[PDB]
Amino acid sequence: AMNEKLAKKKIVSIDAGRKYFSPEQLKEIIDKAKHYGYTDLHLLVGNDGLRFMLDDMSITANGKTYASDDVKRAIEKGTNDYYNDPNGNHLTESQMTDLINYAKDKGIGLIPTVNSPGHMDAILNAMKELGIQNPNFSYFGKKSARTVDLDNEQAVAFTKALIDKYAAYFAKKTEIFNIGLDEYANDATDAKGWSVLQADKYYPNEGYPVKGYEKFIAYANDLARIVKSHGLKPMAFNDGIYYNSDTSFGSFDKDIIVSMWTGGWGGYDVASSKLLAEKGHQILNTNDAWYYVLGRNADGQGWYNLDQGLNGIKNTPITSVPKTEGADIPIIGGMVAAWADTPSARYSPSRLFKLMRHFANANAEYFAADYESAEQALNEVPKDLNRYTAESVTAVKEAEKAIRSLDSNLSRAQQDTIDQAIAKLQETVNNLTLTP
Numbered sequence: 001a002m003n004e005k006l007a008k009k010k011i012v013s014i015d016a017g018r019k020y021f022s023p024e025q026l027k028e029i030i031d032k033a034k035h036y037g038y039t040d041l042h043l044l045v046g047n048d049g050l051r052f053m054l055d056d057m058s059i060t061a062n063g064k065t066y067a068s069d070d071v072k073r074a075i076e077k078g079t080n081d082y083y084n085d086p087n088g089n090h091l092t093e094s095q096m097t098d099l100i101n102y103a104k105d106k107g108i109g110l111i112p113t114v115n116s117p118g119h120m121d122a123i124l125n126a127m128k129e130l131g132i133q134n135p136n137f138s139y140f141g142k143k144s145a146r147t148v149d150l151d152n153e154q155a156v157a158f159t160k161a162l163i164d165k166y167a168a169y170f171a172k173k174t175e176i177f178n179i180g181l182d183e184y185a186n187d188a189t190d191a192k193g194w195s196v197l198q199a200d201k202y203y204p205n206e207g208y209p210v211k212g213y214e215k216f217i218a219y220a221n222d223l224a225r226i227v228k229s230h231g232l233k234p235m236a237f238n239d240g241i242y243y244n245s246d247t248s249f250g251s252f253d254k255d256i257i258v259s260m261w262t263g264g265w266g267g268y269d270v271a272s273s274k275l276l277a278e279k280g281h282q283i284l285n286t287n288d289a290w291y292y293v294l295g296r297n298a299d300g301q302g303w304y305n306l307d308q309g310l311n312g313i314k315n316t317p318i319t320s321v322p323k324t325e326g327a328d329i330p331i332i333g334g335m336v337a338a339w340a341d342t343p344s345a346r347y348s349p350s351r352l353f354k355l356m357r358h359f360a361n362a363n364a365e366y367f368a369a370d371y372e373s374a375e376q377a378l379n380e381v382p383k384d385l386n387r388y389t390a391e392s393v394t395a396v397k398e399a400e401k402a403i404r405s406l407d408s409n410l411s412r413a414q415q416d417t418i419d420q421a422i423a424k425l426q427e428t429v430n431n432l433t434l435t436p
């Protein structure tokens, strides 16, 4: 009576924050997602760069309104300062609405990310262009290019209002909004950002940011409240959520779905997925075992190269969550992610599709089967069979019935059953024999 594996989300993530992707390119990704049995496209649009412009970008914060055309010009410029992509700067509202509709018609959902308080180079740049002072976080004379200072009330207020504006747009047409929250001040702190934010509590009078991590919890919780008010489920990457398993600074909103991408590394001690589940968070398995950075296309070409990602897909199943502590961790689904850390890299659709295809093949019981050729085969049957012999007619009608009788919820693992049924139909049609 249950289809627990197929009921999971299967998601492909595309980094269209750092790098421009056209509507045509994204529709092709949606097509392949549908074909391979995925349920959703996770489209980062704010991730270092910001590459999605609403028709009205006016922002009310700090006792004033920043005019829509000024906000647009500030964001376009700020994104260009991060990376001026010769292929394009941003998707428009019309293009996004069309894209979401295109995906919806195929049974594919779209999940956007607009990242903060890290990975927001372009938003920080935009704020400065609007005239907001000192938005960037700094750590002992090292200014972060990507991370907002949570002590800066004006920068924080603007950012929250911007997330609110995007969330209002995505309301009703999507179900999940990814607020990001990953990798606080990674540049300025040599990947010690969460330690830095927590440090003052335990090492006072050493110049660490006062109430740094407490302010981050408040910030995360406020974004969650904003997203939830629009009927959307907030999602965030795991690394800063109870960093160091420290629950003493406050509590994260339980309605935040956790995208569990990392089990951490030496000197970067993240909460286990066990702890996060126990605190009451649903988890989307986003294991970085499966990561692919565009342009790192073969073994030896760096971390998250395509060969590494395909190896990760082969060796780490959709059910294998980072840092389980040996516990059985339930999941809402799995997400394979392609990134543009070097956004000048060439986007290769065939390589992305290979990654997507391997993820589906390695976990085939979880992915939907493809009925599109079955549907087309049925469309291609001759409508009128009267001029053919009763015997050959019966064979076609039986073969048609057989395809139409297939379980409508088969997995990719059972694709052969569908394909066999199509072949049988084609055979019976070919064998239709005109009456004497």
Ligand SMILES: [Ca+2]
Binding pocket: 183
């Ligand atoms: Ca990173």
Ligand SMILES: [Ca+2]
Binding pocket: 298, 299, 307
């Ligand atoms: Ca190789």
